[PDB]
Ligand binder design. Structure first.
Ligand SMILES: O=S(=O)(c1ccc(F)cc1)C1(c2ccc(C(O)(C(F)(F)F)C(F)(F)F)cc2)CCCC1
Ligand SMILES: O=S(=O)(c1ccc(F)cc1)C1(c2ccc(C(O)(C(F)(F)F)C(F)(F)F)cc2)CCCC1
Lengths: 294, 288
């Protein structure tokens, strides 16, 4: 079956996932909520509306007491209203990014890298590890991310179905969920994406590339030992292609975030560091979180 | 894994091409036809042509329901053709997957369009059989195609007479890995001697490379000397597959003659009534 070194690798990543992924979102508190009650620059606004409306969600908050608060966003009719969920979205993103930083911090193979390379791997993979973790709480039947007492529900349109799948970020979630991956497979995907030698500012290419290869081999070997079903043929290569697709979604998402941020600033200071909104000097929060213990 | 990095990348490209284009669970095979619920020498040969490849059909609904179809026992008549429209839809679905497979390969993509057509015309049936072998259950004599199953008619060991059936039992017995099946598909796809091929030298060179990669994969990844002649056994299976292919084309053409059933894509692949002009659907599918 799997080697002892492989069984230890899976155990360590799994232990790190459980210690740093709060799946019930119990500690997600003090977040902002939406309120109770030219030429050429108009083309920027045209793209920003396309960027936002495709990612449109309604928010549900179930109280411990049994009560339910529901927020339905406004339909697109002008400016300012389209940005109502952004402060909340930035807060959820920030809480998720902090969990991802903690995940990387507990892993010995990441801990033993120079601080600058820790910053560069985190900068390069944060969104990717966030999407992987969010996929585990995605309900593909209801088009809803189920975050404990918080729920994010995809806004139903006249297009589909077919219209929602036109958004690569949404299609990724349905395509990844269809694979019915195990916790071990998701965690090995996070490890693969985290240890990418080709991220900007990475100096220790060889060490990172060698760590990535062993996570990839461990994944292939895990699949071979646990997936004999004819449903799971080529599962390893499907996962690898999904990771390649996630890297592409990531590049598109960064450019999309900058466009929204350019006309409507919303990004938190941690988000501005990870996304490059204006190495140890330009990433103060990251450096501090990395110096702190877990 | 004692292969060249090139050889390792050649396998990776074929494996990638296979995962992208082989719907192993047949989940996208939908909207197919089903048998309804309701000169003399030509008809004599056609009866012999169909009777041997007789199958029952099983369809398992997601709800748990089972629909089963048993074919008629000759007697007439046009009833011997009851499963052809379904079969034409299944082959057409398989053929589209084979075209997509070939399209993702750099070695194939880099060849002139006319040669892409000629290779696809020559190898389509062969690559389909190779993929069907992977879903073949030699114990139950059934091709397990997701929610569909094609079960061989127990008439009445006598199946071994039909070369198309003997092929599936013999190939299955070799217990090949995915990598070996995909290298088999490449060897068959890149056949230089196919009718209408121009670049014989280039195609021959590519085939030899795939064969050497297959040979090397076997030496390095299989317990030697138990698998001493596995490469040669695979090469004999391919030779037998080529003769099965020539026979199957003649068989399909005889059936078509007296009972037209082939879809437009099948008509182009098999030569049923300027290489781009005589293969319009294929050209479109390769240009997409
Ligand atoms: O499942 S998710 O939350 C991860 C989800 C999503 C991701 C990113 C963003 C934003 O990054 C963007 F709007 F700027 F693009 C931000 F968070 F900034 F709003 C919004 C929504 C929700 C909908 C699709 C995926
Ligand atoms: O390849 S199979 O395992 C296959 C399986 C399901 C399936 F639906 C189409 C193909 C199988 C077979 C191959 C070709 C043909 C036909 O080509 C022929 F009748 F014209 F010869 C056609 F498809 F036209 F009917 C019929 C049956 C079935 C049994 C022998 C091999």
């Amino acid at each position: 079956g799997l080697t002892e070194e492989q069984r230890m690798m899976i155990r360590e990543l799994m232990d790190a996932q459980m210690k740093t992924f709060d799946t019930t979102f119990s500690h997600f508190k003090n977040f902002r909520l939406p309120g109770v009650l030219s030429r050429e620059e108009a083309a920027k606004w045209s793209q920003v509306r396309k960027d936002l409306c495709s990612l449109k969600v309604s928010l549900q908050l179930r109280g411990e007491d049994g009560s339910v608060w529901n927020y339905k966003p406004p339909a697109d009719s002008g400016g300012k209203e389209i940005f109502s969920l952004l402060p909340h979205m930035a807060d959820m993103s920030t809480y998720m990014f902090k969990g991802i930083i903690s995940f990387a911090k507990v892993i010995s193979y990441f801990r033993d890298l120079p601080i600058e390379d820790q910053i560069s791997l985190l900068k390069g993979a944060a969104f990717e590890l966030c999407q992987l973790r969010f996929n585990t709480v995605f309900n593909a039947e209801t088009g809803t991310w189920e975050c404990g007492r918080l729920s994010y529900c995809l806004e139903d349109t006249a297009g589909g179905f077919q219209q929602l799948l036109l958004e690569p970020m949404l299609k990724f979630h349905y395509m990844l969920k269809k694979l019915q991956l195990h916790e071990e497979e998701y965690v090995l995907m996070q490890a693969i994406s985290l240890f990418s030698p080709d991220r900007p500012g990475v100096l220790q290419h060889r060490v990172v590339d060698q760590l990535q290869e062993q996570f990839a081999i461990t994944l292939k070997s895990y699949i071979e030992c646990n997936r004999p079903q004819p449903a799971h043929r080529f599962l390893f290569l499907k996962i690898m292609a999904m990771l390649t697709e996630l890297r592409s979604i990531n590049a598109q998402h960064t450019q999309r975030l900058l466009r929204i941020q350019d006309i409507h600033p919303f990004a938190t200071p941690l988000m501005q560091e990870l996304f490059g909104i204006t190495l140890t000097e330009r990433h103060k929060i990251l450096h501090r979180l990395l110096q702190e213990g877990s």
